[PDB]
Amino acid sequence: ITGTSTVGVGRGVLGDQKNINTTYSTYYYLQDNTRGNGIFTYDAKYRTTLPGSLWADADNQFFASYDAPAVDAHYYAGVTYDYYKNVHNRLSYDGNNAAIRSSVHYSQGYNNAFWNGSQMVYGDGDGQTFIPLSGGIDVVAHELTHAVTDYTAGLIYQNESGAINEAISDIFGTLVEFYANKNPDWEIGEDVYTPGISGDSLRSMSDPAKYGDPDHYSKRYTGTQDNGGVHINSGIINKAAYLISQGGTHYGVSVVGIGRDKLGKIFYRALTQYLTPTSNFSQLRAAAVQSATDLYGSTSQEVASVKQAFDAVGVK
């Protein structure tokens, strides 16, 4: 919409008060003119057709129960944009300030959220397995990384190449979650997963085998389900990348953590400079080893920790 930029006030999925950038033209639309070519949040209106109608509001207050997912999708979209712009100096996902569009209230009881090659899609969840999936900041940032990966490494979405893609979106989903400092942790989607149960999550980068994901390359999934298990073998790279940031010993292999910021630096450079559409885990190791060398030197500790954490997960 061509209209006046403004700030609206609304409530998130988890009930937190927020301020959302909106654009006023007769209605208040959930359109952010402050970042890039615009951040747009649509109402799918419980249907599959996308993107739907740009979210409209008569009074610029978004405290309705129906608005709760839209506010989180529009607000956390601006957060993940801020991370890539401030932490990696990348303007939107294509590097050219591309417009960011999300569609909330997707389908009915849909327990998933995904980047379909063009925009963000958020189901509302059935209320038991999931609540509205835009509520978790790591959920938004994760699927937003898929937009980033599409324009850089372009890792195909099957086998190990897809498992790296999934893990890349998990790392940068957690790193954005730490960027907002919004009760951060190394789990995946604990905010919108099983509201009746507490202390559980969809995945775990610290403990992937806590929910049955392989934490070692020997334990990887080699079948054909889940497009070769790209959501399954993401636990190997998650365990690798988390040891990079934090350290510790995995299967008798010690790793000296270099912190979140250096890990976030290493994988992004590897993502946009060295990784290819058909990269496998070993090629990822060479890319992460090569990227740390550029940023820190071959004789530096950051290269050493990358070599150690990949040895810990058995990636050679």
Ligand SMILES: [Ca+2]
């Ligand atoms: Ca309203």
Ligand SMILES: [Ca+2]
């Ligand atoms: Ca949290």
Ligand SMILES: [Ca+2]
């Ligand atoms: Ca999380």
Ligand SMILES: [Ca+2]
């Ligand atoms: Ca839970």
Ligand SMILES: [Zn+2]
């Ligand atoms: Zn994903």
